[PDB]
Amino acid sequence: GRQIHRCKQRLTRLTQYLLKARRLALKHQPALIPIKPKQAHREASRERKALIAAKLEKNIEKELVKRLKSGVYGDQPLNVNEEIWNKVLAARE
């Protein structure tokens, strides 16, 4: 009875495996894309250099003022003030 007892348990425990394998397949479970230590490092270093070669504050500076120079706004925007708009008028003419 011990030997037949252990086989029935395994049949019970194997069926629950097969059931769980079925339900997991049905659900659209997420993939598990791994992480590489070489690509993570190389992209970490290449990025830091880009920030240095991006010049964010300078690039947003010069192109925004040229946007103001071209005047994408109306007659006079609410962000600008008259003190500096006078130099805007002198420079643009």
Partner: protein, 130 residues
């Protein structure tokens, strides 16, 4: 070379480094300590005062006042190197401040001392739009 400050990328800053400089480490630390946070032009004037004995560097950790000139001379080139590196970037000169300075021990071969300096800007933009 990777520095010791989270700033000093191309944002608003320029660097400068000194390696194995033939000056006493203790003097450089005290010189660095007093000039930290001052305006760049203000620091230049103060260093001149030290040469002319108009002002003396306090000695707090390594102890009161003194007038070292060799360590100040080493710092003069580094600060001059600092602003020369600022110009290459093309920053706004009149608002330079000494945001960071650090003196580190060197190999025991006379006690030399690495020196680094970081110049930066101070800015505030009003939100308004209330």
């Amino acid at each position: 070379v990777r520095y010791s400050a989270s700033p000093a990328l191309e944002t608003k800053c320029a660097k400068a480094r000194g390696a194995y400089l033939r000056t006493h480490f203790k003097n450089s630390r005290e010189v660095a300590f007093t000039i930290n946070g001052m305006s760049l032009k203000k620091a230049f004037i103060f260093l001149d005062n030290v040469k002319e004995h108009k002002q003396a560097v306090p000695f707090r950790r390594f102890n009161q006042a003194r007038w070292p000139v060799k360590s100040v001379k080493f710092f003069y080139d580094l600060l001059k190197n600092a602003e020369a590196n600022a110009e290459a970037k093309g920053l706004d000169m009149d608002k330079l401040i000494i945001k960071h300075v650090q003196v580190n021990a060197a190999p025991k071969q006379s006690s030399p001392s690495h020196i680094e300096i970081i110049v930066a800007e101070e800015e505030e933009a009003v939100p308004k739009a209330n």
